[PDB]
Design a protein around this ligand. Structure first.
Ligand SMILES: O=P(O)(O)OC[C@H]1O[C@H](O)[C@H](O)[C@@H](O)[C@@H]1O
Ligand SMILES: [Mg+2]
Length: 290
């Protein structure tokens, strides 16, 4: 079967003996990549992460999430020091921590641009689907089935606040949890309105995220590699969604998981197993010889 293989653009399996770069560090998306469809770390992945720690391979989360929601999803592994959150790349790079919890990237959204996005979202009536991200907290203006769906997956509940409170908040991103039926059209409106203003990414499903135009996960990758004096050629990135494209195309070694879209796969050097098939375990086997 093809379930567990990693292959190049020609469809040929990647062989360790043909690799000339040691992989010292792995950057991975969380939902859709490391976590299976139940948002759990499979036992096969966990076993391989334990071996990677024994061998001194660093595994770094790179996610649209805040560190707070990451801790709520994978906390049991963090508590056992099986997955480290520091260093880590959060809010699509706009908050990137070194191992001391210091932000080596802090990209706040300009406040005028924040209010312009806010006003536009009210004008097209997606404001009710907005989750606004501050450094330590998230906010929404109401609760509906789409906010509910967001909360259940995110596993961290935003505070409900009034409209006029947004002006006083210092924010990094906004995430719209959209109805499927309006996703495609809303994505077009946001991208047309905000090009060369802000990043617009459909990260998973009907979620649309807006965050600092000049920042992305790859900016975090560069900062963390720099920290440890690791050449980019010794780093590997793996991912599934649009917010992974820059880090997949920015590194020579990168793995799109099988469940990723063609656009995401195209940006990656290699295609691996799906997130339900223990992708990082097989990445560790292929690149690091387990
Ligand atoms: O960037 P990732 O770690 O793949 O996260 C992907 C994200 O997709 C959406 O934003 C979901 O609401 C989040 O729960 C999920 O974390
Ligand atoms: Mg993902």
């Amino acid at each position: 079967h093809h379930m567990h293989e990693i292959v190049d653009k020609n469809g040929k399996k990647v062989q360790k003996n043909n690799l000339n770069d040691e992989i010292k560090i792995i950057f991975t998306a969380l939902d859709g990549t490391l976590l299976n469809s139940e948002n759990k770390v499979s036992e096969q992945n966990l076993e391989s992460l334990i071996r990677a720690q024994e061998k001194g391979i660093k595994v770094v989360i790179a996610t649209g999430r805040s560190i707070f929601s990451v801790e709520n999803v994978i906390g049991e592994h963090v508590k056992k020091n099986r997955i480290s959150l520091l260093p880590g790349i959060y809010m699509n790079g706009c908050v990137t921590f070194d191992e001391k919890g210091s932000r080596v990237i802090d990209r706040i959204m300009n406040n005028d641009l924040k209010m312009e996005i806010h006003e536009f979202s009210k004008q097209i009536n997606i404001s009710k689907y907005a989750i606004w991200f501050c450094l330590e907290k998230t906010y929404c203006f109401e609760i509906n089935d789409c906010i509910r769906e967001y909360m259940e997956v995110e596993a961290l509940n935003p505070d409900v606040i009034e409209d006029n409170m947004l002006e006083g908040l210092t924010v990094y991103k906004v995430l719209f949890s959209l109805p499927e039926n309006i996703l495609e059209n809303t994505l077009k409106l946001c991208r047309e309105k905000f090009s060369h203003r802000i990043n617009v990414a459909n990260t998973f499903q009907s979620y649309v995220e807006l965050f600092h135009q000049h920042t992305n996960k790859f900016e975090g990758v560069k900062e963390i590699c720099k920290y440890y004096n690791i050449s980019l050629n010794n780093a590997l990135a793996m991912g599934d969604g649009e917010n992974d494209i820059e880090m997949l195309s920015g590194l020579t070694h990168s793995v799109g998981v099988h469940n990723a879209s063609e656009k995401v796969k195209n940006s990656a050097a290699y295609v691996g197993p799906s997130n339900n098939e223990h992708a990082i375990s097989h990445v560790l086997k292929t690149f690091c010889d387990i």
